[PDB]
Amino acid sequence: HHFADLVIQVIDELKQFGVSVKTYGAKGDGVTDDIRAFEKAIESGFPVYVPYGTFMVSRGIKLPSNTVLTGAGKRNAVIRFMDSVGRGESLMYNENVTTGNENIFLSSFTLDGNNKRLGQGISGIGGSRESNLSIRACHNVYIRDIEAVDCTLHGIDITCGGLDYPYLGDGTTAPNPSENIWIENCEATGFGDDGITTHHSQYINILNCYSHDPRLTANCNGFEIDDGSRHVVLSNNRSKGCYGGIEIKAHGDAPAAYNISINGHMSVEDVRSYNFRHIGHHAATAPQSVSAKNIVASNLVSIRPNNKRGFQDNATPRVLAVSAYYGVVINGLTGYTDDPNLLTETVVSVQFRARNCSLNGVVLTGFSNSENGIYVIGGSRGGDAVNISNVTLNNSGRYGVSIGSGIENVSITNISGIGDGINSPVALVSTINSNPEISGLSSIGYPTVARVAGTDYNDGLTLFNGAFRASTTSSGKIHSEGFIMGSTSGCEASVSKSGVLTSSSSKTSSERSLIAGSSTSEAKGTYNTILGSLGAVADEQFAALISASQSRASGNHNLILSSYGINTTGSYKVNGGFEKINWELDSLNGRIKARDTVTGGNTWS
Amino acid sequence: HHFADLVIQVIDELKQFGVSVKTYGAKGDGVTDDIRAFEKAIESGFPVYVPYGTFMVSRGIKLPSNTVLTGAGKRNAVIRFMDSVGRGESLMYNENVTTGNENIFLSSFTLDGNNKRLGQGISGIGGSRESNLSIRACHNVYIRDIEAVDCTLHGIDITCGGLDYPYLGDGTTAPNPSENIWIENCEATGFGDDGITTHHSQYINILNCYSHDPRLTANCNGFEIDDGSRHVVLSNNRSKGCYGGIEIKAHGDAPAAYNISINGHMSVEDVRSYNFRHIGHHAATAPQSVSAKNIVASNLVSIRPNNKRGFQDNATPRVLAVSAYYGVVINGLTGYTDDPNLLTETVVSVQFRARNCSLNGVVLTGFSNSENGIYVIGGSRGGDAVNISNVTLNNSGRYGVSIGSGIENVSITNISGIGDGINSPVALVSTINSNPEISGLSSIGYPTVARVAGTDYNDGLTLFNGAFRASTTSSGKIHSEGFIMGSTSGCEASVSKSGVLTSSSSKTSSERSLIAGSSTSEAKGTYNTILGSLGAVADEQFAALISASQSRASGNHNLILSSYGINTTGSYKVNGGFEKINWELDSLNGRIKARDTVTGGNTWS
Amino acid sequence: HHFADLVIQVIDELKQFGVSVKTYGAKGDGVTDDIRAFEKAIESGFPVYVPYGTFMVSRGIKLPSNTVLTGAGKRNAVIRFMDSVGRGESLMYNENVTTGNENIFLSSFTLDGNNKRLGQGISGIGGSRESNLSIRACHNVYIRDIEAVDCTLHGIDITCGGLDYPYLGDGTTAPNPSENIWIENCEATGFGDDGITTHHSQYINILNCYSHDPRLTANCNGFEIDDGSRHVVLSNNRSKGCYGGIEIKAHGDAPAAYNISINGHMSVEDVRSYNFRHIGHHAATAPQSVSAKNIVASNLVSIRPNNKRGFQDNATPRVLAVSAYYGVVINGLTGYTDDPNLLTETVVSVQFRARNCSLNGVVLTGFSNSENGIYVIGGSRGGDAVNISNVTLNNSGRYGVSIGSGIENVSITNISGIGDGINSPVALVSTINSNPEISGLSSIGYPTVARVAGTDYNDGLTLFNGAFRASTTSSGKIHSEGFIMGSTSGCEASVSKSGVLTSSSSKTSSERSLIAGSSTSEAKGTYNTILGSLGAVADEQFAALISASQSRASGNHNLILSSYGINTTGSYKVNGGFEKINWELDSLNGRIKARDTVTGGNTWS
Ligand SMILES: [Ca+2]
Numbered sequence A, B, C: 001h002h003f004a005d006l007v008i009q010v011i012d013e014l015k016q017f018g019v020s021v022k023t024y025g026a027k028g029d030g031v032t033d034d035i036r037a038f039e040k041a042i043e044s045g046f047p048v049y050v051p052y053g054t055f056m057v058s059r060g061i062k063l064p065s066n067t068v069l070t071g072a073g074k075r076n077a078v079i080r081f082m083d084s085v086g087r088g089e090s091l092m093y094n095e096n097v098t099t100g101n102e103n104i105f106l107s108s109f110t111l112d113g114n115n116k117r118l119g120q121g122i123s124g125i126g127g128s129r130e131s132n133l134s135i136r137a138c139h140n141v142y143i144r145d146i147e148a149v150d151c152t153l154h155g156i157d158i159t160c161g162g163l164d165y166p167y168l169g170d171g172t173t174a175p176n177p178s179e180n181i182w183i184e185n186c187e188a189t190g191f192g193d194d195g196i197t198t199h200h201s202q203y204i205n206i207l208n209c210y211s212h213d214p215r216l217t218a219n220c221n222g223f224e225i226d227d228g229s230r231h232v233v234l235s236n237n238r239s240k241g242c243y244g245g246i247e248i249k250a251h252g253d254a255p256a257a258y259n260i261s262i263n264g265h266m267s268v269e270d271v272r273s274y275n276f277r278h279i280g281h282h283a284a285t286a287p288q289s290v291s292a293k294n295i296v297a298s299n300l301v302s303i304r305p306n307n308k309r310g311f312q313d314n315a316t317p318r319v320l321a322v323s324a325y326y327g328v329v330i331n332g333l334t335g336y337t338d339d340p341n342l343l344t345e346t347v348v349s350v351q352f353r354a355r356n357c358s359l360n361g362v363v364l365t366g367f368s369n370s371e372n373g374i375y376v377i378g379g380s381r382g383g384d385a386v387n388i389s390n391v392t393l394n395n396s397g398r399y400g401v402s403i404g405s406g407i408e409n410v411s412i413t414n415i416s417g418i419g420d421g422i423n424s425p426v427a428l429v430s431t432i433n434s435n436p437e438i439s440g441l442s443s444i445g446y447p448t449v450a451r452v453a454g455t456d457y458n459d460g461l462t463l464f465n466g467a468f469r470a471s472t473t474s475s476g477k478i479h480s481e482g483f484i485m486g487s488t489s490g491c492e493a494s495v496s497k498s499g500v501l502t503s504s505s506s507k508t509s510s511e512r513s514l515i516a517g518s519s520t521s522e523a524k525g526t527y528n529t530i531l532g533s534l535g536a537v538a539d540e541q542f543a544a545l546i547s548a549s550q551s552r553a554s555g556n557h558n559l560i561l562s563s564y565g566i567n568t569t570g571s572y573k574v575n576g577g578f579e580k581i582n583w584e585l586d587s588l589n590g591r592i593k594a595r596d597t598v599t600g601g602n603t604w605s
């Protein structure tokens, strides 16, 4: 066969793809050990091509800097560990494990870790060892159209320098991150830990990948943005049959992933479709995470979340679970199930030190045997807020939106629900705290619409907090237990239980008071009333004026009526006058007094 | 040419791409029938490669399970029906039409259905027959970089088992769905029905595809998520010159697509850019769709929607049309036109049993001859809501945001509009119902800003519904026609037309009543007034107290003033006193009474 | 070597990829001029393939219509200008520079512009000349997996016909646009102007590209959507180390880009991550841009914005800067920094004639030495609005959300902030205007929560504008300085400072008035009070009625108490009666009158 060899030599020299591994002796026959051909091709300095075949390998494939490795495609070019391979190596990884490599471009092949060779139930022997593809401390890595199957640890792992993962504590940054990574159109399945994962690395885009069906039932996630990750975008990926669809977290002795964006995701039959947390920073008596911050997640799809496989000791399913994190913004979330018995606790939870979270544009459908649709619990932390808006629930949650203890600042707006198909529905909206801000509730089939600290509202509700002002373009100070309405400039209601209506330049510093229909008037005692008056002053307890001009009521329980230009000081007296006091009804002593006459037998014509 | 043949044999055995169809006798010369070479290559068990050429085929290409078929690229590897092919077959489809196949990976070629061969104006002969690519009942199918041209039926169709589409009625699930499908970077054009479409299948991602210019003018859509579809993501696709850009629907005797996500789309010169509907479930006298639920659509672009081509009997253009569906969430929509005469009815409609829909972050520009910007019509359904927020209109709609009949629950917030360039503008916002919730309206060039059930508001408007409470951290019950403001704990306003202001522990169950500036006071008759009082009770019709302490007014039209410690029961009497009644003004009989003296000739010094 | 030549001839005729440039004499040896082989291959009418090599070229590669040009991959197939090339040509461009070409498909190679050959600090000699890839006036162009390095002008430029850019003025459309362009998985770096840019062209998708590190420090942007662009989607791109991450703009003598969608982006260490502007249309005394309209941008990430490189004469960094544009909708924005000294002016600005902008779902973290988090300045324009909602700030901005002059319509809702780590924090929210609409503020570590036109609110605030109505399902007209609450149908409060509470069919047209607890009552003078009354009319200044039925008070300062069926007209009189006036307290003259008797010595038993 010397002629064929000569023809092949001519083809090899053409280098149509770069250099083929077969040029260096690779058989790709599913039997022969091709590791030396891969090593020789890779060290040559040429782009390396992997044609059709199953290329067996007796040890891991080490990648130097400036590597181009391209195959004929998934399930065409297949790279696979031999049955005889021992423990400790990922199938493919960059050669400099501690300080990393640069410019590595991998495309279009299957990595088959042959985990089967070890028997069933086995995961990685320690740290980041034994993934199908491990990238450690590398800059500029493009991973495209790679299928990762039968993986011992992870399918694809991006991590910092070192074989072990570092545990340096919260608020740290591990040395030698990977940086500028792109993972696109990859698939990971049959893995022991996670499908696609990042650790201690930054500037990463994960796009259009599919991670599904772990071998094991521990914390086995489709996409795991783990310890030390930051500045990562995930978009248009799918996860199926995992514990977490996308998990964003850290372990207790590590910094949480931060500044992570989910630009669309579809989670199919995961346990907790979207699961954001920081272990060790959940308890009320634990310190807040200093690292768990900034997640923006949009256009999230969750389908039939369940725990049929028994992941994580039968952890309860979730469409979304947020804990520990500050600053989580969720927009456009649809959760859907056709089986009410799969998820029966809480569809969406925001708990365990999660703070400053916002949910908007949520549709939850079919969770007709779950206790809660959305359930929020806080810690009474200063500067905290939870915002929930534009939510619709279709037979999802005995309590549709439930706010528990420790929440002082909550906004709940435009919530609607259908409860007719729910097993024993209770309330569309429930709060423990007495002062939620609420508007725009609509329901059918819930026996109670809103239950606010035990009080039911079934006919519509609008609740606002703090100093209130309406139909008034400017004013001075308004107390948080005060208001000004329908007024023009210059009004104030500066103490607890004080208010101004329909007035101009009128001020009250009177605890328990009302000024209405008045101008240039002032209340400054307590229990003061000023109505339809001009230049009126009430400056003693229970003093009041009605239809009075340029008058001052300074007596205890002293009321002035229908008067101009008088100042009164009497106790328990009603007075009237015009430039001088002209009559008195004396409640204290039972005297009636006129300046002029008192007469009976009168007529009014 | 025996030498060339030997060289070729050596090349074939190298299998650089897998196996070439030319190895099995394919000519790819645009004339010779290459079907047998395709069949032999495909049955061989190797990945199949299609090099440069136009590969003619006298019958459809049947795909078995575990097929890899890769070409040299669009407009490089071209697969085409011969002129002589008859009717009934799609150009490429999976072999097991009834129960399906698995693991099919198609990349990088053109499918030319040669519809031209049949003469003009022709579509598929029946059901799912005669698309360029038909996938029926398959699991795990990746379709990438395929260009579908001159298609008889659809470009790319994903469907359940069977050549016909099943019509099993609303609320059903057809047997043998396709599942786990990825369609990426594909193009469809010159089709008879739809470019890219799904039926009775689930877990599908359609990404970065371009569907444009149908041959026909029926219901010919760019992307059609049709009968029985569910759990589909579309992202970053473009449609051009179709009827619907993305249509999400079902026919009347089928279940509507449900739980569909649009993560960005661009629609160019379609008729109805985004068109969501369920035929047969639109009429007021028809049953609600049980299947039309859950659409989350974001970052939607609509450009110059028009019906120049006369699709669907000159159906009127739309940026967005929603009907039948429950739970549609739209966020980030820009509609733009440079020709006011293309769309003259309604830019965005939410009508025909659509319910529980939300629109947020909308910009509509240039629709200066359309009657309505956004037009919503409801059905007076329980638990319904329509939420419209953060909308800006630039010369778009004589009525900017219009709410028609059957809508009881509507929130309209932060709407702004410029109407100076509009042909005869009427109102930025109009509602038929008397109780919309409205705030944050801003306009120029509209003669009326808000028209609420016939009443105009041109100077700003804030409307809220239900029980109202402001500047009060806790309270007991508030009636839906009641309020509490500026108060501390323990207050109630529990009946129609009852209210508490600036008070503590004060309760009214009095229809037509007001308590203000008071403590521990109670109104329980009707027409009751309590002002600036402590421990005051008004418990008869028209009874009242002002500046009173520890007193009870129990008479008909009985008013107490400036008093301590009295209980009165007289009809049409004003009373005052201190531990005992001390004076009376008797309106009924015209008597004035003092306990002590009545005198004239008084002075106040 | 005649045998090798014969073998090669056989391989060439197989056309496995199309036609190789090596078939036409290309060496790809990094030295030999291969331009003639490229020209001959390209003119042949076959798809052209570029295998492994560095292919040197002594002049630009001209592309005709219907070109397919595919390489072996980035850093595999490399196309490069020779050192000796002069000035004036882009490395690759379509042949018909003035009226354009169609159907051009470019994939999988590096373009190396060899800008180095000119010495350092050099950019393009004029207009659109000397980019790595220039597309002028073309329809249907797909650019995929192209790496553009060492570029003289831009990496990839899409423009209209002509070598120069046209400057036709605002509101124009340049002839011969490019149309239907797709740029995907491309990289641009080491460019003189912009990485990837569009001019005077439409229907463009830019997806998953990476633009970084310009050579120069002028207006050198990652992605520049420039002069004349429209209908462009950018999604899942990354920019790093540029001036603008994504710039959307125009120069002064050109139309601004319009109707642009950003469906997710990550900006790393740019100066102004997102920078939208129209030069020449920013000044208060300049005309508004007629073209700068419609930007919808979502899921935006900004990381460590800074100006360490000194771009644009040390322009100050921004997460987001909006100017000139109408109708900008931002949803889901996270800005993050770990270095407080990089950005010290304003994190997010909306200024310089930007109008009708909305921000929602914003998290800003780490900007602890910046003066402002969000800073908005307007122009007092009619129909303008700025909407800011669901914002959380983590040690970002001495003023968290600041509203400056010229803003009449602002909505600020659900803002929370932590200020404890800020260098001298001032206020979470500050406004210059007296009438912002505000609710849902929460903070810790800011000395003031809200400062509204100089007045501080630290204990919560709810402010609404315009006519106000609550707990009332229908009403007649309400003045913008009026209100109706807790009422049933038929009420009106039609003038400044008029209000109705807890009433039915009661109307006030009385300036400075209040009706409460009443039915069928009417106030129509001024300074009118009607309380707990039925069929009561107050129609003179300071007239009032309390606990009155079927009575009319028509006197100046005339009050009726505890009465039925009387009409009074006296000045400064309190009256009561039953079908006739029965008593009077005359404040004017100091007379007390009874119809019947006046007596002392009374008891009430
Ligand atoms: Ca894990």
Ligand SMILES: [Ca+2]
Pocket: B193, B194, B219, B220, B221, B224
């Ligand atoms: Ca159709």
Ligand SMILES: [Ca+2]
Pocket: C193, C194, C219, C220, C221, C224
């Ligand atoms: Ca530039």
Ligand SMILES: [Mg+2]
Pocket: A197, A224, A226, A227
């Ligand atoms: Mg991990």
Ligand SMILES: [Mg+2]
Pocket: B197, B224, B226, B227
């Ligand atoms: Mg159909």
Ligand SMILES: [Mg+2]
Pocket: C197, C224, C226, C227
């Ligand atoms: Mg430019």
